[PDB]
Amino acid sequence: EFQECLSKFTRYNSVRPLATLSYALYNGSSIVSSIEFDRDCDYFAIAGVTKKIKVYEYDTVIQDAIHYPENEMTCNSKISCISWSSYHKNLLASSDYEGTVILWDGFTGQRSKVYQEHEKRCWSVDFNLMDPKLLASGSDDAKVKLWSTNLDNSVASIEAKANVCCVKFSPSSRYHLAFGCADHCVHYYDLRNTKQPIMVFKGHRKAVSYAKFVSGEEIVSASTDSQLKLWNVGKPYCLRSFKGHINEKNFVGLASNGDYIACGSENNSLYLYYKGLSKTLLTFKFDTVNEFVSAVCWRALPDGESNVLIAANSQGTIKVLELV
Amino acid sequence: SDQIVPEYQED
């Protein structure tokens, strides 16, 4: 399997920018907290500190140079995360610093559900990839709350030992969930029993800022110790550590597509790794005019070549990038 | 500012 590791590590050798946008305003903070594609990858949404969710049509963006959002939604507070529904093309969730979990029609801007149970800042939301009605959120109140789109109040809650910074549903089960906690660990639960975690992954020295599913069998986590960590669902300790980037403080973003991992860095750059090798595959350096990349996401086009992703730094600069 | 990851002691 070594030769396949080689061919996969040398698959890409260059990067090409396709577009450049600005999330901003009065020279204020314009950090982009979240970037997510809709189900068909026709549109992508951008959310950050300016309290605004901006939606863009992908095909319109990568043509001409002048980029106005297809729909812009003003919010009450600063936004930390967004997530599109895998079942409903217009359903798009958002979490803010008030602890609110708002369900949006990403186009009409209407509000169908406003969930207000979190008592402190909410860091992450995510839709269940195998249940259309379910979604989840995690907050600084050491709580992971489960929501149903057909109900006003939460259906269940997992009580953690410290702050919850990121949540994610498994892409292979409607009952498996994972979240990264301030206790430097990654917790893995079967929502049927929440007493009672399935696994607690130890290895990080700082709070687990990010946690994504590479697949149904492998998780990738990002923590503020300049470390990415690859875990197996069955092994309580990491399979491989990815170093080379600088992530000691901020939510710099983490994204995974198939066999490739991308994360931001505090030298104003995006780093790309292959999940079976610890060394950096390649790096893209943002221009500048203390700046850190803040959000990344793969354009995971079903049945195709995930050669393109979107990254965004703390300056509000957003770039669509194709791997050559 | 914002986007500051939390931190646990633990004493």
Concatenating the DSSP letter of every residue in A224-291 gives TTTEEEEEESS-SS-SEEE-SS--SSB---EEEETTEEEEEETTTEEEEEETT-SSEEEEEEPP----
What are the Cα distances from residue A97, in Å, to A81, A132, A144, A148, A225?
A: 10, 25, 15, 21, 24
Which runs of consecutive H residues, i.e. helices, occur in chain A?
A: 2-9, 58-61
> Considering only alpha carbons, which residue of chain B is nearest residue A314?
B3
CA atoms of A290 and A268, how far apart (whole Å): 8
Judging contacts by C-beta atoms under 8 Å, the chain B residues touching residue A250 are 3-5
Number of domains within chain A? 1
Q: Which two tokens stand for residue A204?
A: 């990080």
If we measure between CA atoms, which residue out of A107, A116, A105, A51 comes closest to residue A77?
A51
Nearest CB among A31, A184, A209 relative to B8 is that of A184
| DSSP designation for A196 | S
Q: What stretch of H or E contains A220?
A: strand A218-223
Alpha-carbon dihedral of residues A209, A131, A41, A50, nearest 10 degrees? -50
What lies within 8 Å, CB to CB, of A303 at 6+ separation is none
Judging contacts by C-beta atoms under 8 Å, the chain B residues touching residue A140 are 6
| DSSP designation for A59 | H
Judging contacts by C-beta atoms under 8 Å, the chain A residues touching residue B8 are 162-163, 182-184, 207
CATH number of the domain at A279, please.
Answer: 2.130.10.10
Nearest CB among B2, B4, B8 relative to A183 is that of B8
Q: How far apart are the first and last CA of chain B?
A: 26
Contact B4 A163 (CB under 8 A): no
Nearest CB among A29, A49, A207 relative to B5 is that of A207
Q: Say whether residue B5 is in contact with chain A using an 8 A CB cutoff.
A: yes
Nearest CB among A207, A294, A314 relative to B7 is that of A207
HSE-CB at A273 with a 13 A cutoff on CA atoms is 27
Long-range Cβ pairs for the range A297-306 (8 Å, 24+)? A297/A35, A297/A36, A297/A37, A297/A44, A297/A253, A297/A255, A298/A255, A298/A256, A298/A257, A298/A260, A298/A262, A299/A37, A299/A41, A299/A44, A299/A58, A300/A37, A300/A41, A300/A257, A301/A41, A306/A257, A306/A258, A306/A260
Contact A286, A296 (CB under 8 A): no
Judging contacts by C-beta atoms under 8 Å, the chain B residues touching residue A49 are 2-3
If we measure between CA atoms, which residue out of A277, A292, A278, A284 comes closest to residue A247?
A292
Contact A294 B1 (CB under 8 A): no
CA angle A18, A19, A24 (to 5 degrees): 160
Q: Which two tokens stand for residue A183?
A: 């206790």
Please give the distance of CA A265 from its chain centroid, rounded to a whole number.
Answer: 15
Omega before A196 within 30 of 0, i.e. cis: yes
What are the Cα distances from residue A241, in Å, to A123, A209, A236, A300?
A: 24, 15, 14, 24
Structure resolution, Å? 3.9
The residues that bridge with A191 in the sheet, in sequence order, are none
Q: What stretch of H or E contains A197?
A: none
Q: Which two tokens stand for residue A122?
A: 């909410």
Judging contacts by C-beta atoms under 8 Å, the chain A residues touching residue B5 are 165, 206-207, 209, 224, 249-251
> Considering only alpha carbons, which residue of chain B is nearest residue A222?
B5
**Domain coverage including residue A233:** 1-324
